[PDB]
């Protein structure tokens, strides 16, 4: 029922983890391989291993989560070697995804060059939206710098590339970004990264709940679904059909999944809910989506993909 | 206990309606005068009467609300005549607030000139953030256009003036806005307006729930409190102390109010929760805040105003 075609590859279902969640180590990644997730993605990496921010840096909230992780990761070479060894095994339906989040333009170009030069045959996600690193202002909110970076990347990177974007809140912003992105042979857009720089407060202790950045953190979960869906939808009606969409934000039930697919997402990523529940989420949410499809008499995602009705 | 000083005026308590909610007509306004609200503000006005967007344009949600009202209002002259008559009566503790949201810069300047020339002795709120007018961006996301408008305004406007701002999501945006705003004799900043251009979907009808703008609308309520607190707090630590703060977003309980005051808000505005509950909300929330204060042994808002603790 959930069979999906994306970036010219076949996946059993559209569900994945969101980058940063359950994908730090090889052991995390193999747990995702073993789960019912249709695909999976690595933790965003930098050239060097990073410890990340001081703890506490992630807190579960009734309506989602807050975090300032600071891009803790085991480094580019570790993920690159894991994905190379795993594509030789031919042990999964569909390629692995590989996230990079360089602390500078030059660092992104350097990682993209190592990926190009390698035998890596899966998909790359360039994170232009990391909101938890104190001194890098979300690059995808800087339309000039975003265009300049992408022009350089496409003079050499021929492999499948998507960009993870932060949320936009203004229709003109969607128009500007779509005109930038539509000029490139991009494989996809992934909307959205966390709602940036929110605050959660413990009113008894009169205090913030994370240590870094005076408690300011990326917000995820049910808080953000309205923004997430809007971002997926707004890009769906503006992007050239060659650029497909991964929908991320607020997905916990099959009904949430259903709503993202109705907006025009082809793959779906689960952050906060996967953090809380672990990889058994995939089996649950697949079954919820299938039941919604069965009640409606739908046998494939194409029956409703992108078919959100206006009034 | 809740006695508050703001813009050199005394109010019995910090609570207000948010503009747009329960303030369209004289009758609405008089209902707010009659309630326990410490103060009240008019519906954002334009030079001409406006019908607003087609219906449905406001929907209650479990986690807040979505709307694309389109600035329906009875016109500038109606609100100006109402407030002029009202200040003559000396029938309330503290001045009325008067919101304007011109469809252009020239319209805002024309209204501010009429206010300046009038005997209006209360407080004006310039809305630089309406996210529901078709074809018209949020001006306060345009830092050059915001600065240029405010420089013109302060060559003539000497009466108390605040600006209603949309939410920002990037620390560098806070710094840029604070350097702009700190160069002016502003009375206040009101953070935040709705989270712009979110989407809500009815999964059974496979449809959006508001008619204008293909269902895209300003998000309010519990969804936005983390953003709203963050914006209140980020401006508190960056604005020169002559510019005070009104906190708006996600206030429904005394605990939500307490959280805003802890961040540094002096007045508090209630939108979505007042829309659902009516003006009886003010009595309830005042009592909830006082009980929180009593449990903590606090006798005045200055015992915790702005005292949010970092880790
Ligand atoms: C623990 C934490 C770490 C994250 N790290 C990354 C990151 O490495 N790179 C990235 O692109 N997104 C990162 N994300 C953002 C998620 O990929 C996702 O966009 C966001 O959490 C919203 O989805 P959700 O509502 O299901 O949580 C992280 C999210 C969280 C919760
Ligand atoms: C029905 C509706 C109409 C609104 N109209 C205005 C408006 O005229 N001017 C304005 O500055 N804000 C307007 N707002 C935004 C609110 O003032 C407020 O900033 C927003 O609702 C967030 O607060 P809340 O979370 O308590 O709803 C409106 C909100 C709603 C719900
Ligand atoms: O369309 C309006 O009247 C309206 C105006 C605002 O400034 C915010 C909002 O959420 C709605
Ligand atoms: Mg599997
Ligand atoms: Mg009263």
UniProtKB/Swiss-Prot annotation, chains A, B:
Gene Ontology biological process terms from the UniProt entry: 'de novo' pyrimidine nucleobase biosynthetic process; 'de novo' UMP biosynthetic process
Detail which positions bind substrate.
43, 67-71, 127, 193-194
Q: Where does FMN bind?
A: 19, 43-44, 127, 164, 192, 221, 249-250, 271-272
User: How, per the record, is the cofactor bound?
Assistant: Binds 1 FMN per subunit.
What PROSITE patterns would the database entry show? DHODEHASE_1 (PS00911), DHODEHASE_2 (PS00912)
Q: Which CDD domains match?
A: DHOD_1A_like
Give the Enzyme Commission number: 1.3.98.1
Name the domain of life this protein comes from.
Bacteria
Q: Which PANTHER family match?
A: DIHYDROOROTATE DEHYDROGENASE (FUMARATE), DIHYDROOROTATE DEHYDROGENASE (QUINONE), MITOCHONDRIAL-RELATED
The entry describes its oligomerization and partners as: Homodimer.
Similarity comment:
Belongs to the dihydroorotate dehydrogenase family. Type 1 subfamily.
Recorded protein name is Dihydroorotate dehydrogenase A (fumarate)
Instruction: Tell me what organism the protein belongs to.
Output: Lactococcus lactis subsp. cremoris (Streptococcus cremoris)
């Amino acid at each position: 029922m959930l069979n999906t075609t994306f970036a010219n590859a076949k996946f059993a279902n559209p569900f994945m983890n969101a980058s940063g969640v359950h994908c730090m180590t090889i052991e995390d990644l193999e747990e995702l391989k073993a789960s019912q997730a249709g695909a999976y993605i690595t933790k965003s990496s930098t050239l060097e291993k990073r410890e990340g921010n001081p703890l506490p840096r992630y807190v579960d909230l009734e309506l989602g989560s807050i975090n300032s992780m600071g891009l803790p990761n085991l480094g580019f070479d570790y993920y690159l070697d894991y994905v190379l060894k795993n594509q030789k095994e031919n042990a999964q339906e569909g390629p692995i995804f590989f996230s990079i989040a360089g602390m500078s333009a030059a660092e992104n170009i350097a990682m993209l060059k190592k990926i190009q030069e390698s035998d890596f045959s899966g998909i790359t996600e360039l994170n232009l939206s990391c909101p938890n690193v104190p001194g890098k202002p979300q690059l995808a909110y800087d339309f000039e710098a975003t265009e300049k970076l992408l022009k350089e990347v496409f003079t050499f990177f021929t492999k499948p590339l998507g960009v993870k974007l932060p949320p936009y809140f203004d229709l003109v912003h969607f128009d500007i970004m779509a005109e930038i992105l539509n000029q490139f042979p991009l494989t996809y857009v992934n909307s959205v990264n966390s709602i940036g720089n929110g605050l959660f407060i413990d009113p008894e202790a009169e205090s913030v709940v994370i240590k870094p950045k005076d408690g300011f953190g990326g917000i995820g979960g049910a808080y953000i679904k309205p923004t997430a869906l809007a971002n997926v939808r707004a890009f769906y009606t503006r992007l050239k059909p060659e650029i497909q969409i991964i929908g991320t934000g607020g997905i916990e039930t099959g009904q949430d999944a259903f709503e993202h697919l109705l907006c025009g997402a082809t793959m779906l990523q689960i952050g906060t809910a996967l953090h809380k529940e672990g990889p058994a989420i995939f089996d649950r949410i697949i079954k919820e989506l299938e039941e919604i499809m069965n009640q409606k008499g739908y046998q494939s995602i194409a029956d409703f993909h992108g078919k959100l009705k206006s009034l």
